Amino acid sequence: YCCGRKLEFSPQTLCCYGKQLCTIPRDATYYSYQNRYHFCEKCFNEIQGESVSLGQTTINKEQFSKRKNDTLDPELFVECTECGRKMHQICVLHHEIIWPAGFVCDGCLKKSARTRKENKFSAKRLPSTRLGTFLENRVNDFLRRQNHPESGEVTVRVVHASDKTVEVKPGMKARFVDSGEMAESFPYRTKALFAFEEIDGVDLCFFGMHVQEYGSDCPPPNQRRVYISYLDSVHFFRPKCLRTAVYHEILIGYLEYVKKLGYTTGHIWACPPSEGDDYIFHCHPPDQKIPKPKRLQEWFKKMLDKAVSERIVHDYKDIFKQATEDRLTSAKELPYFEGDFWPNVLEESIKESGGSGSQKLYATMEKHKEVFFVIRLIAGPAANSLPPIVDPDPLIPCDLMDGRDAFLTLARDKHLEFSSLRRAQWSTMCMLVELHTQSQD
Ligand SMILES: COc1ccc(C2(C(=O)N3CS(=O)(=O)C[C@@H]3C(=O)Nc3cccc4[nH]ncc34)CCCC2)cc1
Ligand SMILES: [Zn+2]
Ligand SMILES: [Zn+2]
Ligand SMILES: [Zn+2]
């Protein structure tokens, strides 16, 4: 073995198909059918009756297998076509698409005064966008101002852009849409972008983001607004003392960019993911922790405070303070975003109140105010006569990056973990190959 190390992949986590938001971690005992339908021990024995409705097909309980989530797949080896040396594929970062001729180890290459032919599936060679260019220029300019000897070049790429609509859910639809008081759906553009850092001639994907952008063609209350769907990171940015600043630089640059195009407001739901290691990146490092709510909120406040002092953000408020200043009276006046908290809670509010869309609206907003940031980018009379929003970047069809589920599934299916620096670099290389090959079609 190249290193002296016996290496295997970790058991990926599963789901109690009974209770939503239940998960089955490493070493837990569970019940599975056809390697598809998984139940944890508690959620399985808590089923009354040996009939288990699947799909919908009813399936007997003895047709399930009792097992524990402790399977460890060994890492794969590659063989040098010249010496026969066996090395972990991840250790030497050999990808058969990038180097189809075969794996030649570094030792045989140095003996023959040879080097690997260029990796043309790099982050740098992903197609550029005006947004990506703006973001990476900001980050790299910040990084060279810091003069830290360890920092590498950062490239930012938009890897998906497509048109979508968010549909008002049945409760709010019956209250406000069927009476003609509110649009049935809101058109928006979703964008997925990632940041990579060159670490010793090797790309590392360390940051990912998906956003929802509602243009000047959107009906109120959503028009000229951007909303962050989700954020994620792999904490191996070099150097560590600049990691937080770089995240902040990307986010501030994004607000600066959409402000320039004419978007008036930004929206952030400070919402930690559920415990586990899969959000956008599969299998986070074991010592990278999900922040607790208060610390995440302070993190966003720090970022926005820097944006205010840079004269990019005019000001920001919690949703409760914001609605008070806007003199809001009805739930139909709240921006309605895909997958956001407020569409969900408004469904429950209308149900519990027997059909009201304003009853406890202010109480619910105050109860949760610290979690919802409303960021004003264009204020005062400047926001009044704005020209239409024209995005200079084209659409980018890429099914793998339409939402976060597809890339997570591809990572799970192909053992692309981001749990260590070496595995994250390998997963980055594979992810780039996928993005380069799906595009050339
Ligand atoms: C104050 O400490 C922090 C630490 C990290 C962040 C950022 C971030 O990556 N955050 C906070 S998030 O927005 O709730 C989602 C994401 C996050 O927690 N990922 C994960 C880390 C570890 C295991 C995980 N499993 N699954 C997801 C996941 C870094 C850049 C974006 C914010 C912010 C504040
Ligand atoms: Zn090795
Ligand atoms: Zn369960
Ligand atoms: Zn060799």
UniProtKB/Swiss-Prot annotation:
Residues modified to N6-acetyllysine: 19, 169, 306, 332, 360
Binding positions (acetyl-CoA): 231-233, 243-244, 290, 295, 299
Mutagenesis or variant effect for residue 402 to R: 70% decrease in activity. 90% decrease in activity. 90% decrease in activity
Compartments reported by the entry: Cytoplasm; Nucleus; Chromosome
Post-translational modification: Acetylated on Lys at up to 17 positions by intermolecular autocatalysis.
Result of changing residue 230 to R: Loss of activity
Domain named CBP/p300-type HAT: residues: 120-440
Residue numbers spanned by region Interaction with histone: 230-232
Recorded disease: Defects in EP300 may play a role in epithelial cancer. Chromosomal aberrations involving EP300 may be a cause of acute myeloid leukemias. Translocation t(8;22)(p11;q13) with KAT6A.
Domain notes: The CRD1 domain (cell cycle regulatory domain 1) mediates transcriptional repression of a subset of p300 responsive genes; it can be de-repressed by CDKN1A/p21WAF1 at least at some promoters. It contains sumoylation and acetylation sites and the same lysine residues may be targeted for the respective modifications. It is proposed that deacetylation by SIRT1 allows sumoylation leading to suppressed activity.
Listed name of the protein: Histone acetyltransferase p300
Full protein: residues contained: 1162 to 1664 of 2414
